[PDB]
Amino acid sequence: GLNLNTPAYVKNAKLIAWVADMVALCKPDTVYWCDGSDAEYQRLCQQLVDAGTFKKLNEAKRPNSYLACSDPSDVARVEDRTYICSAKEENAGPTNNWMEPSEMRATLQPLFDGCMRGRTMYVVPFSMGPLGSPIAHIGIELSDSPYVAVNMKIMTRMGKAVFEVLGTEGDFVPCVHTVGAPLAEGEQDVTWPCNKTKYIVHYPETREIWSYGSGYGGNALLGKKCFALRIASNMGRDEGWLAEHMLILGVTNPEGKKYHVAAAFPSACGKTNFSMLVPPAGFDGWSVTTIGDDIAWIKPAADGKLYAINPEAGYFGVAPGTNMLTNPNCMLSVRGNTIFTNVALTDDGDVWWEGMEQDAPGKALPDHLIDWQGKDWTPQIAKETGAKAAHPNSRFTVAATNNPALDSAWDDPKGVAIDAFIFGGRRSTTVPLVTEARSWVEGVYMAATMGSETTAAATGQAGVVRRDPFAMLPFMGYNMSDYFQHWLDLGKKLAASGATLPKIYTTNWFRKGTDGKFVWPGYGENMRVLAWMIDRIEGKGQGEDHVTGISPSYEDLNWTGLDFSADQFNTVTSIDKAAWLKELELHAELFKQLEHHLPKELGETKAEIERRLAA
Numbered sequence: 381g382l383n384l385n386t387p388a389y390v391k392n393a394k395l396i397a398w399v400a401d402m403v404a405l406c407k408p409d410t411v412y413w414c415d416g417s418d419a420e421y422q423r424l425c426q427q428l429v430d431a432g433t434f435k436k437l438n439e440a441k442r443p444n445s446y447l448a449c450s451d452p453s454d455v456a457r458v459e460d461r462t463y464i465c466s467a468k469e470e471n472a473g474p475t476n477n478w479m480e481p482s483e484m485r486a487t488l489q490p491l492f493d494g495c496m497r498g499r500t501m502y503v504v505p506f507s508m509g510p511l512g513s514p515i516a517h518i519g520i521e522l523s524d525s526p527y528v529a530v531n532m533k534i535m536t537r538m539g540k541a542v543f544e545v546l547g548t549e550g551d552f553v554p555c556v557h558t559v560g561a562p563l564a565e566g567e568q569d570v571t572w573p574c575n576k577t578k579y580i581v582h583y584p585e586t587r588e589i590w591s592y593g594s595g596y597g598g599n600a601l602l603g604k605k606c607f608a609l610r611i612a613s614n615m616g617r618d619e620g621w622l623a624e625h626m627l628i629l630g631v632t633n634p635e636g637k638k639y640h641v642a643a644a645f646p647s648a649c650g651k652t653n654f655s656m657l658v659p660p661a662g663f664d665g666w667s668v669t670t671i672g673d674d675i676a677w678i679k680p681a682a683d684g685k686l687y688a689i690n691p692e693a694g695y696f697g698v699a700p701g702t703n704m705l706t707n708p709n710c711m712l713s714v715r716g717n718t719i720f721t722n723v724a725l726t727d728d729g730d731v732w733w734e735g736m737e738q739d740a741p742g743k744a745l746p747d748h749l750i751d752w753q754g755k756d757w758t759p760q761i762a763k764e765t766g767a768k769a770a771h772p773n774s775r776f777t778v779a780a781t782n783n784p785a786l787d788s789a790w791d792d793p794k795g796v797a798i799d800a801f802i803f804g805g806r807r808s809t810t811v812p813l814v815t816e817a818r819s820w821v822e823g824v825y826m827a828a829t830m831g832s833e834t835t836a837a838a839t840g841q842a843g844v845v846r847r848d849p850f851a852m853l854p855f856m857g858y859n860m861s862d863y864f865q866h867w868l869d870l871g872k873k874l875a876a877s878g879a880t881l882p883k884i885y886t887t888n889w890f891r892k893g894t895d896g897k898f899v900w901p902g903y904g905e906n907m908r909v910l911a912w913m914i915d916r917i918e919g920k921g922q923g924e925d926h927v928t929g930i931s932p933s934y935e936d937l938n939w940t941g942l943d944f945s946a947d948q949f950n951t952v953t954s955i956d957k958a959a960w961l962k963e964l965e966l967h968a969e970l971f972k973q974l975e976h977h978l979p980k981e982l983g984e985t986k987a988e989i990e991r992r993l994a995a
């Protein structure tokens with residue numbers, strides 16, 4: 381067998397044998413075990429610079445930061461190539477792509493057979509959740525991509541410290557990744573190796589994750605979406621907890637009372653910006669802190685509360701639109717020690733993306749840039765062709781500790797108590813600004829039936845309304861109808877303690893006017909919606925009952941510092957009967973597709989909403 385170069389601190393015989401089997405299959409030239417040190421990170425970055433995958437940015441403008449640009453075919457998630465290969469198809473559900481496990485194993489085995497020829501297999505040990513904590517889970521990702529290795533260092537607890545927790549007998553999540561571009565001897569590589577054929581496959585029975593053909597973070601950082609959502613949602617279903625596509629934030633009012641909220645928005649629909657928003661004018665004495673921006677693990681306790689942890693260690697966030705007005709905490713976070721992917725390159729060796737001109741002199745575009753495809757870019761080219769300097773799904777990768785608004789409990793394994801949930805899709809019509817569910821069941825209905833317009837975070841036509849229950853359409857690890865039942869059973873467990881359940885809200889920042897522009901300013905101004913939620917949590921906020929729940933009146937929000945009239949508020953909060961009749965018919969189509977094991981409570985809630993519309 382090939383020399384594994386197993387470090388002395390790896391004491392797990394079962395792990396070593398698994399690496400041996402995977403090395404025998406993928407046939408890498410060499411094997412390197414990542415220790416996760418800062419020194420190793422710098423060596424791997426220099427190796428990426430040598431390969432042309434990375435360009436080191438200007439140390440004076442963006443210290444210890446790098447820029448990568450990808451193949452145009454490998455810029456986002458590929459949902460059609462993502463599979464849940466459960467033993468039974470009914471345990472994948474209509475929202476997932478299924479294939480018989482042995483049939484998929486026969487499909488992938490020749491693809492991974494020799495996939496790493498001419499490359500180095502990097503062994504990437506990582507922990508999701510704080511190292512050695514009772515809620516943490518350890519995985520090992522084998523990858524032939526140093527880009528994956530350095531991004532995993534930022535996004536997870538990565539390296540040799542994992543093996544101290546694993547010991548001689550600890551179990552791990554087996555993760556295999558390849559760019560699917562084996563190299564012949566003497567063959568020159570490309571700067572972004574990938575394959576037109578891609579597979580992202582999950583075997584829930586064995587917790588195996590197999591990724592082929594893509595270097596993009598969503599497809600290749602196997603601890604993130606593949607384990608911490610798809611695999612972990614299965615485990616939580618069996619063990620009584622949740623893995624959710626949710627940010628976690630803390631918010632403290634001027635009276636010193638602190639609350640925590642978890643919000644599920646679909647990919648590229650506002651989680652990162654909300655999770656670290658800065659309270660605008662009129663909110664002196666308020667503070668917003670970040671626990672996480674993408675994934676939450678949640679379980680109930682005996683005290684009747686729901687406790688949430690963020691299992692990740694960094695942010696892998698959409699770049700375009702970020703500036704000092706929309707998200708200054710993020711701007712400050714990516715000041716250094718950041719990996720940028722598919723943004724533009726300035727003449728001075730800095731990065732640039734659409735939206736940064738809002739902080740520029742005269743709010744003007746840069747005179748010249750090199751776009752994410754390596755082409756010359758000018759304001760004239762952009763004005764005449766609409767060419768974007770940064771890809772719409774371009775990303776930054778940055779450690780959570782770079783965030784000035786990072787909550788002191790961001791890595792507390794005890795978690796934070798969730799006082800309210802928020803669900804919200806990208807909807808140009810229909811959905812009002814904010815609505816409070818009348819009960820846990822009606823809140824689960826809200827989350828189960830939410831829709832959202834597609835974004836550049838996955839390949840395909842953007843701007844199309846689709847059902848995205850709980851913002852988990854691309855990430856649910858089992859049948860979506862059983863997942864609905866899981867949320868309903870959780871609420872009953874909480875209610876049996878005698879506790880008051882967390883409120884559930886539906887939000888929409890994205891209503892559009894006749895010109896296609898957003899009616900609600902959003903970003904920092906979303907604090908005015910969050911503050912009403914806090915009022916409702918304290919029992920001091922008023923609201924009016926309407927078809928889908930309780931909404932604030934104009935006088936129930938704080939408008940200090942924002943010129944937003946009562947007429948504008950009426951536009952984004954009015955319940956339009958015709959629009960919601962059409963929307964409920966789209967709910968019925970969803971329920972038809974999800975008929976198997978669909979909870980009866982959802983059809984009962986729908987019938988109640990239909991009555992309120994026909995009243």
Ligand SMILES: Nc1nc2c(ncn2[C@@H]2O[C@H](COP(=O)(O)OP(=O)(O)OP(=O)(O)O)[C@@H](O)[C@H]2O)c(=O)[nH]1
Pocket residue numbers: 645646647648649650651652653654673674696697698699700701702706837889890898901902903906
């Ligand atoms: N109009 C408007 N745009 C927003 C708002 N919040 C975020 N955006 C924009 O929407 C895009 C997505 O924002 P993010 O906060 O990164 O979305 P996300 O949910 O974190 O996306 P993922 O990381 O893929 O899960 C960015 O271009 C933002 O500039 C908002 O409140 N109003």
Ligand SMILES: O=C([O-])C(=O)[O-]
Pocket residue numbers: 457598646647648674696837
């Ligand atoms: O990468 C992400 O956060 C996504 O696609 O949801």
Ligand SMILES: [Mg+2]
Pocket residue numbers: 648651652673674696697698
């Ligand atoms: Mg995000």
Ligand SMILES: [Mn+2]
Pocket residue numbers: 625646647674
């Ligand atoms: Mn996400």
